[PDB]
Amino acid sequence: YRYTGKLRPHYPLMPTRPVPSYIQRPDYADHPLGMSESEQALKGTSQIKLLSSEDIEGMRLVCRLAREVLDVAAGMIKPGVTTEEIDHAVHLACIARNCYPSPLNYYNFPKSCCTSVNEVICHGIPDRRPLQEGDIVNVDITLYRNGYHGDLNETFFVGEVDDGARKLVQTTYECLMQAIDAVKPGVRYRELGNIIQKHAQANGFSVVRSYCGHGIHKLFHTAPNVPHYAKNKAVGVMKSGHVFTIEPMICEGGWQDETWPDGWTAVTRDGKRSAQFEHTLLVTDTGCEILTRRLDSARPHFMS
Numbered sequence: 666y667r668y669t670g671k672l673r674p675h676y677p678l679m680p681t682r683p684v685p686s687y688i689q690r691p692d693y694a695d696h697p698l699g700m701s702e703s704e705q706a707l708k709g710t711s712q713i714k715l716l717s718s719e720d721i722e723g724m725r726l727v728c729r730l731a732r733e734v735l736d737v738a739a740g741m742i743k744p745g746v747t748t749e750e751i752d753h754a755v756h757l758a759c760i761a762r763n764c765y766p767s768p769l770n771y772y773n774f775p776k777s778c779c780t781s782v783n784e785v786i787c788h789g790i791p792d793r794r795p796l797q798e799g800d801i802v803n804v805d806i807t808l809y810r811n812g813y814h815g816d817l818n819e820t821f822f823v824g825e826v827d828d829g830a831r832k833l834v835q836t837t838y839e840c841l842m843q844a845i846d847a848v849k850p851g852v853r854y855r856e857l858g859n860i861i862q863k864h865a866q867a868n869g870f871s872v873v874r875s876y877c878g879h880g881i882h883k884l885f886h887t888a889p890n891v892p893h894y895a896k897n898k899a900v901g902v903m904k905s906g907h908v909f910t911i912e913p914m915i916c917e918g919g920w921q922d923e924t925w926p927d928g929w930t931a932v933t934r935d936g937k938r939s940a941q942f943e944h945t946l947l948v949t950d951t952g953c954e955i956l957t958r959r960l961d962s963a964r965p966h967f968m969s
């Protein structure tokens with residue numbers, strides 16, 4: 666395998682972390698290939714759940730808890746910290762909040778969060794590599810509580826970064842917020858990729874095509890499919906009571922991705938950097954609520 670950049674996996678991985686049996690588990694947690702029977706059943710349906718009041722309270726709760734866990738991870742980002750140590754802290758933080766860390770054994774993913782450095786687009790596996798000054802790193806969190814999943818991510822700076830890193834991360838965050846600002850009943854899910862790609866291209870960046878936003882609630886990934894690029898053919902119209910993610914991945918060079926031999930880590934084919942942000946959103950009559958927002962600070966972590 667020809668690595669596309671400088672990054673390499675740093676093995677061994679710490680042995681798999683257990684979740685106490687007192688924590689409710691999603692179906693895939695105990696499936697040997699990590700398959701979700703509930704996702705596979707709804708595979709090939711395009712109908713989007715209208716959440717009940719009970720469902721909405723359950724999503725507010727788990728999305729609030731997932732934000733608290735991302736904020737734990739954000740506190741740790743500095744030179745010399747391993748991504749494995751971030752994952753260990755995340756894993757304990759979930760457990761402390763009576764949540765299952767959704768990524769764990771999702772299609773056999775080995776860890777409790779994804780940590781994506783520099784050319785990694787998404788789904789990076791926490792490992793023994795110490796963060797270096799100049800790195801950008803994304804931490805992607807998803808929790809499962811009382812049957813509901815809540816999903817968010819942010820990209821962070823590792824000490825001082827270059828002007829390129831600042832522009833890439835700022836623009837990706839702007840893409841996400843412009844998409845969110847368009848969300849309201851009656852808007853087609855395919856329109857968000859037009860707004861995202863228009864703002865990436867105006868700043869000289871490309872948009873990953875292989876990974877999309879998703880419906881989320883009782884399932885980790887379900888309808889709708891929400892592409893981040895222009896002129897996609899996503900099916901569906903936003904209705905009050907829909908919940909889904911927007912999670913644009915923006916790249917310095919081309920959009921093309923490939924996967925490491927580990928089967929998970931997605932990287933730019935050209936080895937240039939990619940950044941990502943993600944929120945979980947509830948469509949309301951007036952617009953949108955950001956279920957994974959910060960409650961106690963106006964700005965994402967990179968802004969400070």
Ligand SMILES: O=C(NO)c1ccnc2c1ccn2Cc1ccccc1
Nearest residue numbers: 768771772774788805806807816929
């Ligand atoms: O937080 C997440 N997204 O916002 C999240 C998303 C999608 N897939 C995930 C994670 C967790 C683990 N896998 C599963 C996987 C399956 C085949 C290839 C690569 C990864």
Ligand SMILES: [Co+2]
Nearest residue numbers: 805806816817
């Ligand atoms: Co996520």
Ligand SMILES: [Co+2]
Nearest residue numbers: 816910912943
């Ligand atoms: Co997601």
Ligand SMILES: [Mg+2]
Nearest residue numbers: 673675794795
């Ligand atoms: Mg090394």
Ligand code: NA
Nearest residue numbers: 782783785939
């Ligand atoms: Na990256």
